[PDB]
Design a protein around this motif. Structure first.
Motif, PDB file in Angstrom:
ATOM      1  N   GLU D  63       1.062  -1.071  -0.009  1.00 20.97           N
ATOM      2  CA  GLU D  63      -0.003  -0.154  -0.054  1.00 20.97           C
ATOM      3  C   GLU D  63       0.822   1.156   0.024  1.00 20.97           C
ATOM      4  O   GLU D  63       1.634   1.517   0.795  1.00 20.97           O
ATOM      5  N   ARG D 123      -3.285   7.626  -1.843  1.00 19.46           N
ATOM      6  CA  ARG D 123      -3.230   6.368  -1.233  1.00 19.46           C
ATOM      7  C   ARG D 123      -3.738   5.405  -2.487  1.00 19.46           C
ATOM      8  O   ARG D 123      -4.792   5.588  -3.086  1.00 19.46           O
ATOM      9  N   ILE D 124      -2.853   4.325  -2.893  1.00 20.23           N
ATOM     10  CA  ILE D 124      -3.285   3.257  -3.627  1.00 20.23           C
ATOM     11  C   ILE D 124      -2.624   1.904  -3.047  1.00 20.23           C
ATOM     12  O   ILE D 124      -2.095   2.098  -2.326  1.00 20.23           O
ATOM     13  N   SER D 125      -3.090   0.866  -3.726  1.00 20.40           N
ATOM     14  CA  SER D 125      -2.617  -0.501  -3.231  1.00 20.40           C
ATOM     15  C   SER D 125      -2.192  -1.220  -4.574  1.00 20.40           C
ATOM     16  O   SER D 125      -2.623  -1.130  -5.659  1.00 20.40           O
ATOM     17  N   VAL D 126      -1.092  -2.422  -4.300  1.00 22.32           N
ATOM     18  CA  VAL D 126      -0.497  -3.006  -5.232  1.00 22.32           C
ATOM     19  C   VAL D 126      -0.779  -4.338  -4.792  1.00 22.32           C
ATOM     20  O   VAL D 126      -0.441  -4.865  -3.637  1.00 22.32           O
ATOM     21  N   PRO D 127      -0.924  -5.584  -5.582  1.00 17.41           N
ATOM     22  CA  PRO D 127      -0.836  -6.842  -5.255  1.00 17.41           C
ATOM     23  C   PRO D 127       0.387  -7.265  -5.153  1.00 17.41           C
ATOM     24  O   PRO D 127       1.089  -6.561  -5.664  1.00 17.41           O
TER      25      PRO D 127
END
Ligand SMILES: CCCCCCCCCCCCC/C=C/[C@H](O)[C@H](N)CO
Ligand SMILES: CCCCCCCCCCCCC/C=C/[C@H](O)[C@H](N)CO
Lengths: 232, 235, 235, 232
Positions: D63, D123-127
């Motif tokens: 994140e 804010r972003i999320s990455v797998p």
């Protein structure tokens, strides 16, 4: 019985947010206050301190709210862009900043709040973080005992009613933004709200002005005012 | 649309929050996991692992391989202690840099029983008894065997068993102790003495070395994650 | 996403609000509570506790141990009152600094019956009768026994019982009275007179001291929490 | 057993956001830093690096949170309107910007975030985007092997413990706004939070200051301090 006591409950008695600290943080060209470390406690102010010291032991989950107010300092027409304030919690043992750009600000494991000026006051909650089973507003003892075999009296010398030197750590507040050509001075006011409060061993309220973190009294020791014995 | 009220704290970034965020790479076929040996589910699992103690930290011995060796001998003074250190598993220099201490220095509070394993690395022809004592805090740190005897202790016969396990049980006024030097959460002291002596025959080394290891027990627990002071970065 | 409308009041911090906030230390194993004696669930529980009254507040007696003692004597003037004070449990100097008054000065409104316990601390050979009277407001404050007699009152025989409980019932035009001096929510007056006299034999102290205590009854209640004026901080 | 280990779990151990990069982006009249490309990694900082290197293999969903702080640079009374920052992710192989107005900024298929200054941190999320079944904090090997038939030694020469040159790409950060008559300098701080973390093969923590992306050590190789053998 139809009149209720809903407002006299312990939870309601502490359901207000009390200011416990005012911290000055300045942004200017880098003797300076680019970062301010404040030790966490309610004893910097008397109101909430007096309310809590109505009892001997307490156990409550805390709620902290930060109100930031910024102003210019002798600006002519020098202006600044909206600032971001970093409030980092440093518990006992963790390294403390030595400058406003120190590595400790990375906040790898220390919780931190990044607050953008002009937004809502920054609010977070803390659980009961007490080592014991309840907080001790009054501690009738020391942390060290001077023994016969001690080389010098300073080995066992300890402050009376002092439990730990670093009670719960500090809050380090800085301005993340680099220095604008004009100085900007900000005040962060911290408001502490107990919640889920439980209290034990009620005590009489303080009758004279507080003098330090203890029960010490120095001045204004004549609270009661003149009144006739038989005067209504 | 739906009337809403912005509560205080809005537009703040708390580094410890747990909020859902948009995915920057949607519909991504992540590589499936495999059964790699050595999976760790808790950090206290690492602390439970015994690791050697830098018992000797003299000026000419620390930061070497000699700092893990404590010299025993038949010519030693049987009245003086062999080694002595406070029960501070995160602030004591001898325990701070151990794996247990390294894990603790990421937390503010700790509670549990410790386990000190002392290994004798002399000849098989060397025999002796060692008194390993733990003294709870409050009294004078044991400067003699007659004092350390009075606290918790175990006698270790070198000839029979080359390793001894001194378990320090959790005895504290507070439910949790601080991982920082504090006289209010002081944990106690650990001392070692010659119960009888080290006896060796001829054609045998009269000086030997012992090693120390420290570990946490299953009751061990830590609290209030924080930043360690061991690692620093030049800014 | 979901259409929303920001209502007035958004982005405000009300110190009395009750909103959920993010936890800065998630997954924290708080120390469990124990059964500590003396748990308090309401602040009115403290007010129900009787506490001594600074009845005497003369210039040379207030802010001492003499301010809690009221002198009785056989040589006293039987026509004049012993003590007199208004029924203002939060603004009257004699009641303001009592525990009841201290709790009240944190609230704007109060309603309930009071309980005044007067304790005679003379010799066991001293006997007498004391008339303790409560006069509801509206008329002249009783300056004589013939007047105080007409209001609520109780006769207290010193020889038989050393303590007397004068209960002041809740009689008010309004459902709640203010904890501040206000002639509209005035509560009444309390007076004390010599019903017969104090009679002592020879070889006995002819002057004695009585103590006063004030408490709230189970019907007592307070309203509108506020900030007390007793404690101040230099800014 | 009533004391719990909820906070010592791997998920809780990494549940804090650690700063991994500070990037300087300047807007001025177009030797310059109108766009900044930063290679993605946690090794620019030591805290999170040390925490991760407690283990040999890891698998976690990331994140990222971006905190942008802008300031003026020697402004007299020159002022600027609120700026918009473009943060474009460039994975290995995709073209990289050569200027702040290059075609690559079109973000036809490269994900990008447009952040308006003064708003909440982006804010972003990455797998888990690892080629293998888990991330490799330590790689005891090379990517190329020098063979007997190689014409020159440089064909097979590779960095030790280096797996791929372009690990996961870069982030290119620019100011979308055209240049105001006064310079504006901004710092973007990237905070990385692992989530759903799984770890394998625990390792001893680093005891000496990091020197580069590897296990190399150069200085301050005497960590332990002086202490008496029999001193409590
Ligand atoms: C940026 C995140 C901020 C995190 C703040 C965590 C601070 C933890 C302090 C919790 C308790 C402080 C106040 C309560 C304790 C009282 O002083 C007790 N009576 C101790 O004597
Ligand atoms: C504007 C959208 C931003 C999109 C950002 C995607 C970046 C992808 C990077 C994901 C992983 C980076 C950090 C984790 C990998 C560790 O360094 C491993 N230990 C590799 O050695």
């Amino acid at each position: 019985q139809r009149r209720s006591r809903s407002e006299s409950t312990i939870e309601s008695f502490f359901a207000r947010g009390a200011c416990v600290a005012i911290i000055e943080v300045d942004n200017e060209e880098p003797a300076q206050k680019l970062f301010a470390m404040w030790r966490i406690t309610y004893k910097d102010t008397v109101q909430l301190r007096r309310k809590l010291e109505f009892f001997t032991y307490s156990r409550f989950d805390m709620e902290l709210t930060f109100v930031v107010t910024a102003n210019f300092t002798n600006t002519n027409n020098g202006h600044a862009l909206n600032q971001v304030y970093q409030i980092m919690y440093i518990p006992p043992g963790a390294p403390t900043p030595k400058s406003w750009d120190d590595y400790t600000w990375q906040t790898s494991s220390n919780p931190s709040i990044f607050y953008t000026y002009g937004a809502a006051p920054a609010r977070i909650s803390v659980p009961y973080v007490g080592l014991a089973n309840a907080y001790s507003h009054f501690y009738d003892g020391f942390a060290k005992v001077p023994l016969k075999t001690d080389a010098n009296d300073q080995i066992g010398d300890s402050l009376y009613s002092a439990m730990t030197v670093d009670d719960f750590g500090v809050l380090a507040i800085r301005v993340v933004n680099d220095h604008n050509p004009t100085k900007v001075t900000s005040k962060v006011r911290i408001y502490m709200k107990p919640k889920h409060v439980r209290v034990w061993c009620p005590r009489p309220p303080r009758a004279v002005p507080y003098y330090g973190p203890g029960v010490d009294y120095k001045d204004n020791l004549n609270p009661l005012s003149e009144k006739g014995l038989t005067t209504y | 649309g739906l009337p809403v009220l912005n509560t205080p704290g809005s537009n703040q970034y708390l580094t410890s929050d747990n909020y859902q965020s948009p995915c920057a790479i949607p519909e991504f076929d992540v590589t499936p996991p495999i059964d790699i040996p050595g999976e760790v589910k808790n950090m206290m699992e690492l602390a439970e692992i015994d690791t050697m103690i830098p018992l000797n930290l003299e000026n000419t011995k620390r930061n070497t391989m000699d700092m893990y060796r404590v010299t025993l001998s038949d010519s030693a003074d049987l009245s003086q202690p062999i080694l002595c250190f406070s029960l501070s598993p995160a602030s004591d220099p001898r325990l701070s840099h151990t794996m247990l201490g390294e894990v603790l220095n990421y937390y503010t509070h700790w509670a549990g029983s410790l386990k000190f394993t002392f290994l004798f690395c002399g000849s098989m022809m060397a025999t002796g008894k060692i008194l390993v004592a733990y003294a709870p805090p409050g009294a004078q740190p044991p400067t003699s065997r007659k004092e350390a005897m009075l606290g918790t202790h175990v006698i270790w016969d070198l000839g029979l068993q080359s390793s001894c396990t001194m378990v320090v049980p959790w005895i504290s006024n507070v439910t949790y102790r601080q991982t920082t030097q504090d006289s209010f959460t002081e944990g106690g002291y650990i001392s070692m003495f010659y119960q009888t002596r080290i006896v060796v025959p001829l054609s045998t080394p009269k000086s030997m070395s012992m090693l120390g290891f420290v570990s946490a027990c299953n009751d061990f627990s830590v609290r209030l994650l924080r930043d360690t002071t061991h690692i620093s970065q030049s800014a």
